[PDB]
Amino acid sequence: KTLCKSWSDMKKHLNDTVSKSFIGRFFKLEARKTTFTTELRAATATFLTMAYIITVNANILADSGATCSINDCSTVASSSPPGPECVLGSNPGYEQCISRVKKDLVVATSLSAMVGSLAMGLLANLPFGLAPGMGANAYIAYNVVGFRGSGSISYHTAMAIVLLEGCAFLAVSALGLRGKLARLIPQTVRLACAVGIGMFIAFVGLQMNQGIGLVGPDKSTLVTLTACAETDPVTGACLGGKMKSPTFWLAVVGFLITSFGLMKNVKGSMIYGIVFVTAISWIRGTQVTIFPHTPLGDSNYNYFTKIVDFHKIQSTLGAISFTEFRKSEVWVAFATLFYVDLLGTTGVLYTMAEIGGFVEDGKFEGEYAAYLVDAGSSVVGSALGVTTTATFVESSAGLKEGGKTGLTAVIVGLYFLASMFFTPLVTNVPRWAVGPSLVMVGVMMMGVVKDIRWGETKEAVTAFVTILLMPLTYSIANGIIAGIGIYLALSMYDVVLGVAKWLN
Amino acid sequence: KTLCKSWSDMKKHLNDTVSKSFIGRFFKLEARKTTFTTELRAATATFLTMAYIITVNANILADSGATCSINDCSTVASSSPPGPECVLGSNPGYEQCISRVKKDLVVATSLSAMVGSLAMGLLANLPFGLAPGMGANAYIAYNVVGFRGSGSISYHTAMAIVLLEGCAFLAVSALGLRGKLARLIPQTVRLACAVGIGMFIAFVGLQMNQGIGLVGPDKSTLVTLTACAETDPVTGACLGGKMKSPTFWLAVVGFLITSFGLMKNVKGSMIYGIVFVTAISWIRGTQVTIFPHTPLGDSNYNYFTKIVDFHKIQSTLGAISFTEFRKSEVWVAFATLFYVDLLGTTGVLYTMAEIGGFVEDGKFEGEYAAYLVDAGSSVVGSALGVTTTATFVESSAGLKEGGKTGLTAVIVGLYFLASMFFTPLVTNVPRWAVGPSLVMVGVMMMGVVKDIRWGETKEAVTAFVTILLMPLTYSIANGIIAGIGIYLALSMYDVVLGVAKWLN
């Protein structure tokens, strides 16, 4: 009929008047042959494969106990609450503190993914998006700061490391010291570190108080399968009954329809696994509720019955303190976070330049203004309370549908503006819904393990120690250090002595 | 000179009179073109790459607490010793029991690797050797029986599972039900199960009471790096001082010269890593001694000062009890050990037949009499107290030097006879010397991970859950079950319903 004919000739005309206006001259839409309409399809598919890190990042930096401390705890029958009693849960005053910080990290992630993505398109003309990157969320929140105020480094110092690393990554890039520096790292340590982070981030998404709750303590094997139904109220311990938890099996169904959606190539599928096992866990009354009948849960439901809200940052705003940079374990956390960002935004940003055909004999057309926008956005992301940004590989779903200019990245920046207003629906995602989303990240990073040269022995001993010691010793710093230490001693003690025997 | 000329013409004549005697007619040395001398070189290189499993198997089945029970414990100030006080160490009576069982498992491994290897050559004419296979040592000793009498299944029942699995693997092979049965298992579950066993067997060789002592307990992260120097006398706990254990750093030096020996292609190298960090840990006086000044250690040194001994099996001889086969977790241990032997001796025994050129369009010349000798040897190995046998992949070092007949496997059977008489030197290998040997096994099994199809999603979700849940939940049964359960639900719920929609 002429109904679709009246629909098709308008899209032949709306794509002309955009290119005949001024906005086609800035983004250069005449060359880089494309139209206005197929840029909008390139940014819709980029956002849906990227919309999961708006909730994963909030539910993983609220476990850090961001600004809640011992002073704003509750009052009990004693004269004063002691040290470790408040920060392990079951409190009227501390749990209402941490419900006002997760509302300040959903807004602070959209405002960090706006500025990173909206400044990528306007300054570099490149079709990809930015957000706080996955992989360095778990290093700061679980290994530097730790689960609810553990560890040694406070959260105010951890947001000062991101500034001083962010300013160290502009002025190692503006001088030209990148190809001199990144090629110094060998291929096997660079490639096996991305596998071990994928196994650390999935062992996070299995524990009792972190994600679903499979693994647990044991007094002779040091880890065992619990999955227990009736557990301890105060702490997490198995009282009895294995594999019959209604919060465990509802999370497995979310893990299947995420994986049954990735095959058959549904673009956004990790967002539909989160929405399905959340929309069951909102009905009051069941055993899988996030809304119980406690006074600690009536305040979340009375905020849920309104579906939109304009919420402002008020707790985890600019909070920096350089008054702790004169001890030892601050700089070790500095040299680790400088290491994992140098290898994250180097192998990705050039690989996403050869898809779509930007590249010539080196030096694609947005080289110099993409290393700095990816670096300055960690500085503006550190004042707002979140971690470093990274150019996402999910942005490839927009490279395979015809996005080639910077109008892709501006529209991606405008869905994050249209998703900070839905704050009452995003703070209320349960921690067993975000569990399988931390496991499918580990599936997609282990897919690079078929490029490690397992033929030679020195390349396989170095790659095995780095992969193994990251999820076991519960440390990312103990896999980077114990990989370089094996790679030198197997190599320096015969080759370097042999070169120094012949160079003189 | 004529000195080597007088050496070379004798080896031209000694190789003739062996082939002109009757012993060249049985093994058929005229065809399969080879001589007597280069068979002896093929069996020397086969033994040295196989001599490590004479000490690893004894030091991993003595941690099981094989026949030592609560009745032959010591006597203390109380009227009777309680249950868990004896079996956790620090006892005059229980520790002298377990020093008489490790002397009955060094002899029982050589007598099991004799009969398996000496009957492979005489009945099948194939050049490889047999011993109790690595991979099923840790399943029985740490996961069925457990560390020193833990768990539910006693050791007398675990040696009855090996009989009833051994007799079930003759009469699934003699009827012809192997190609019908083994091809039913898909490729990804078959291939990823061999990677997760390699990561379970290496997490064993890092713990505080098992191997060296890196990982340890923690009350908030459930695993942490201890490596602590001054520990608890009774139990294992970190009192203070990280990374300064003299038993930790002596084990790292053994891990380097094992790995520095595998590259540059030294044939036996895992045996020279064990001998070097043992021969330092025999000098009385140091901090790394295996011979302290206790009465529990004077009895090991007074047995060490003699260097040869004829020792007889007296504790872990024929000990079978079918009086526990009417409960649940016995058969689950049966179907796991039947699973891992079906996939171990199928992908190996055909791969070791295409090297050396035995094969034609299927059906190499020792098909039917090698599935049964590999199966009947687990029956005769179960009466003597050790686990199932397997055709070793280290036997390939003899396939690449010209071994093609059964005289290779007979001579391998005669080095194990000449290494049961050195029992006082083999019981005295410390548990931190056997530690890195359990880690280089995990390096050599992870080298098959570059053949898993990480392209498709169903092949990568199934392979990731199987690899991850074996070293974490400390279970081999929880990786086989949780791999099939993901592989059906991603596949049966759309394909099988679609086939049943079209078949009718």
Ligand SMILES: Nc1ncnc2[nH]cnc12
């Ligand atoms: N840190 C990161 N770098 C690149 N792509 C990512 N996708 C998710 N996290 C990422």
Ligand SMILES: Nc1ncnc2[nH]cnc12
């Ligand atoms: N179980 C096993 N099967 C084959 N080769 C092996 N090498 C060591 N253990 C083995």
